[PDB]
Amino acid sequence: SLTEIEHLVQSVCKSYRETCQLRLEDLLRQRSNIFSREEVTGYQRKSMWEMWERCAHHLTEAIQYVVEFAKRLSGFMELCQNDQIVLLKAGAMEVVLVRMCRAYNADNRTVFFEGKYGGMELFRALGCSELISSIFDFSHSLSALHFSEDEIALYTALVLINAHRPGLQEKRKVEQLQYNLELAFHHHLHKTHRQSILAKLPPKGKLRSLCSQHVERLQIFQHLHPIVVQAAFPPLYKELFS
Numbered sequence: 001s002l003t004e005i006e007h008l009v010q011s012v013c014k015s016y017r018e019t020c021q022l023r024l025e026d027l028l029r030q031r032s033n034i035f036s037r038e039e040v041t042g043y044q045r046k047s048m049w050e051m052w053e054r055c056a057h058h059l060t061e062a063i064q065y066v067v068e069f070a071k072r073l074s075g076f077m078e079l080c081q082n083d084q085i086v087l088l089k090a091g092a093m094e095v096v097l098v099r100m101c102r103a104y105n106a107d108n109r110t111v112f113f114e115g116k117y118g119g120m121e122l123f124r125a126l127g128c129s130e131l132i133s134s135i136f137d138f139s140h141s142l143s144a145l146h147f148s149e150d151e152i153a154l155y156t157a158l159v160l161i162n163a164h165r166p167g168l169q170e171k172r173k174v175e176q177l178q179y180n181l182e183l184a185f186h187h188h189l190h191k192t193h194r195q196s197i198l199a200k201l202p203p204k205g206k207l208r209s210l211c212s213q214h215v216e217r218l219q220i221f222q223h224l225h226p227i228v229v230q231a232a233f234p235p236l237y238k239e240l241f242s
């Protein structure tokens with residue numbers, strides 16, 4: 001069924017298009033729109049907890065778009081609810097991290113944050129310079145691949161649909177989805193003469209370790225200074241918040 005796989009490609013790309021928050025053309029246009037030194041200093045003088053509140057809410061929104069992305073993946077809703085949650089808890093923040101590279105400019109090492117581009121010194125008040133530097137470096141690595149929009153869509157679908165996640169109840173069912181998405185991805189790379197990115201993608205442990213350091217920091221901030229979340233996915237919220 002060649003058209004089944006082509007239909008999967010089109011359905012993954014559409015779900016991605018509907019949930020990607022900002023258009024790539026917008027991010028690229030805005031690359032010349034850079035925070036002044038005066039604006040940077042304004043961010044640096046903000047309280048750690050106000051920066052935390054801002055960043056925690058951007059990350060919450062980013063997670064919720066990734067959840068909607070997964071819910072629109074063919075067959076995701078047909079998994080048992082325990083499995084949907086296992087997959088989202090393990091991979092939705094990894095997808096957020098991958099998606100960030102779209103908003104990263106490697107020429108000057110800046111990210112699109114709250115309407116303009118700025119460097120990692122924008123986040124000085126958070127006092128997490130090691131984590132921030134790891135996120136920038138990871139985004140720097142990915143930007144070298146010059147990911148197309150469909151590659152990011154297909155790759156991030158696979159970040160989520162991983163039948164090796166511990167705790168899955170219907171592993172065979174997740175495997176079926178995973179095989180079709182892998183075929184979708186590899187077919188698409190072949191059609192576009194882009195199979196060379198396959199050897200350049202992040203080692204799986206790199207993404208896993210960055211996200212576990214990232215989420216652990218968010219849990220520390222959330223314990224010290226909890227933000228209020230507009231919970232759209234009760235079974236998922238319940239696993240992350242306590």
Ligand SMILES: O=C(O)c1ccc(OCc2c(-c3c(Cl)cccc3C(F)(F)F)noc2-c2ccc[nH]2)cc1
Pocket residue numbers: 056057059060063064088089090091092093215218219222227229230231232233234236237238240241
């Ligand atoms: O709308 C909903 O129901 C909903 C449900 C779950 C949900 O989790 C968000 C989340 C967080 C996080 C964030 Cl982003 C901000 C502040 C504190 C945390 C904290 F660390 F405390 F959890 N970290 O990892 C995640 C995560 C989710 C899935 C994988 N990982 C956000 C929204």
